[PDB]
From a paper:
Integrin α6β4 is a major component of hemidesmosomes that mediate the stable anchorage of epithelial cells to the underlying basement membrane. The β4 subunit only pairs with the α6 subunit to form the α6β4 integrin, which is a laminin receptor required for maintaining the integrity of epithelia. The third and fourth fibronectin type III domains (FnIII-3,4) of integrin β4 mediate binding to the hemidesmosomal proteins BPAG1e and BPAG2, and participate in signalling. The crystal structures of the individual FnIII-3 and FnIII-4 domains were solved and the relative arrangement of the FnIII domains was elucidated by combining DEER with site-directed spin labelling.
The structure of FnIII-3 (1457–1548) was refined against data to 1.60 Å resolution. The asymmetric unit contains two copies of FnIII-3 that are almost identical. After superimposition, the root-mean-square difference (r.m.s.d.) for all main-chain atoms between the two molecules is 0.59 Å. In our crystal structure β-strand A extends to A1468, similarly to as observed in other FnIII domains. Y1494 and Y1526 in FnIII-3, which are phosphorylated during signalling, are adjacent in the structure. Near Y1526, one of the FnIII-3 molecules has a sulfate ion coordinated by E1501, H1503 and two of the waters in the cleft. This anion is of interest because sulfates frequently mimic the phosphate group of phosphorylated residues. In the other FnIII-3 molecule in the asymmetric unit the position of the sulfate is occupied by the carboxylate of D1519 from a neighbouring molecule in the crystal. Collectively, the pocket near Y1526 has a propensity to bind negatively charged groups, despite being surrounded by the acidic residues E1501, E1518 and D1519. The sulfate near Y1526 in the crystal structure suggests that FnIII-3 might tolerate phosphorylation at this position.
Numbering used by the authors: 1454 to 1548
The structure:
Amino acid sequence: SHMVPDTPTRLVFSALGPTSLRVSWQEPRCERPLQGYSVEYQLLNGGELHRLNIPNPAQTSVVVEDLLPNHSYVFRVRAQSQEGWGREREGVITI
């Protein structure tokens, strides 16, 4: 039922200046060892797909840079096990 990781907990956003933030979550349940996370983010109204891969399940935060002021973004965080990638936790924010 949770061989691939469950969804992470709700995303917490912390502003770090005008073009950066910290995105944070908590480690999701999994019946298999967690291998890491992906953080995918994209302008709400369209743009390039950005991805940060975090190969350590103990790191549940990351600093995201070069964001556009006054623009809205969709962040999607997933965790990986040997069984595959789990469902995303989605959170949105305006910079």
